[PDB]
Amino acid sequence: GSSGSSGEVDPAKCVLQGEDLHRAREKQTASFTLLCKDAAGEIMGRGGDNVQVAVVPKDKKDSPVRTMVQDNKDGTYYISYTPKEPGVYTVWVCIKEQHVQGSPFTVTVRRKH
Helix, strand or coil, rough: CCCCCCEEECCCCCCEEEECCCECCCCEEEEEEECCCCCCCCCCCCCCCCCCEEECCCCCCCCCCEEEEECCCCCEEEEEECCCCCCEEEEEEEEEECCCCCCCCCEEECCCC
């Protein structure tokens, strides 16, 4: 659609999509969309990128967190994670060995009712 990327995807230009991305619930499945933009900071509408997703509790380090990643190769990635214990966590989102904008970030998980 009358579009033309600069050359490749840029992590510093990439962004995250989703409401209350910094708020999760204990034993809950939180998913968000990862938009891929080029060096021009515009939609590239392509895939073939290396996305790295990993969540770790700010409390412990040897205790990882369940995560999921379903590559689409269309322009939007599908990431999902579910905390096992309440508290604070650190979501790691980087592409091509590079931390994207507003990332990594923190996540305050609450206790289930």
